[PDB]
A paper describes a structure:
BsCspB is a relatively small protein of 67 amino acids length that belongs to the cold shock protein family. Notably, BsCspB shows an overall thermodynamic stability of about ΔG° = 10 kJ mol−1 at T = 298 K and possesses fast unfolding, ku, and refolding, kf, rate constants of about ku = 12 s−1 and kf = 1070 s−1, respectively. In previous work, we have used auxotrophic E. coli strains to incorporate fluorinated phenylalanine (Phe) or tryptophan (Trp) amino acid residues into the Cold shock protein B from Bacillus subtilis (BsCspB). Our findings show that fluorine-labelling of proteins utilizing singly modified amino acids like Phe or Trp does not cause a detectable alteration of thermodynamic and structural properties of BsCspB.
Focusing on phenylalanine modified variants, 4-19F-Phe-BsCspB deviates most in ΔG° from wild type BsCspB by 1.5 kJ/mol. This property of 4-19F-Phe-BsCspB has been one rationale for the crystallization of this variant enabling to obtain atomically resolved information (see below). The fitting of Eq. to the data obtained for 4-19F-Phe-BsCspB using one-dimensional 19F NMR spectroscopy yield TM = 318.4 K and ΔH = 176 ± 6 kJ/mol confirming the thermodynamic analysis done by using 1H NMR spectroscopic data which has illuminated TM = 318.5 K. To investigate potential structural changes in 4-19F-Trp-BsCspB and 4-19F-Phe-BsCspB, we have elucidated their atomic structures using X-ray crystallography to 2.05 Å and 2.1 Å resolution, respectively. The samples crystallized in a closely related crystallographic lattice, containing one single molecular copy of modified BsCspB in the asymmetric unit and sharing a same space group symmetry. Furthermore, wild type and 19F-derivative structures displayed identical conformational rotamers for the modified Trp and Phe residues, indicating that local structural distortions had also not taken place. To our knowledge, this represents the first three-dimensional structure determination of a fluorophenylalanine-labelled protein possessing more than a single fluorination site which has been reported so far. The analysis of both the unfolding and the refolding reaction of 4-19F-Phe-BsCspB leads to almost identical values for fN, namely fN = 0.191 and fN = 0.189, respectively. This result shows that 4-19F-Phe-BsCspB folds fully reversibly and that there is no apparent long-term folding rate constant additionally present which may explain the gap observed in the amplitude analysis of the kinetic data.
Numbering used by the authors: 1 to 66
The structure:
Amino acid sequence: MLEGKVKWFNSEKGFGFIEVEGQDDVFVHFSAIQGEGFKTLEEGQAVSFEIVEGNRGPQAANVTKE
């Protein structure tokens, strides 16, 4: 699992970017967010996650709020 920080997140639209040291920023969609409750992220929130890449390029998967 990768560790990173939420760079920014549009809570209304349900998407943002995770920033991570060395690597580029990682697009995160709300459907990647684990746990219970309404799925959203806060700027600067610590997350653990993976990067999954299909034919639309890399994005965050299995994002867990730490």
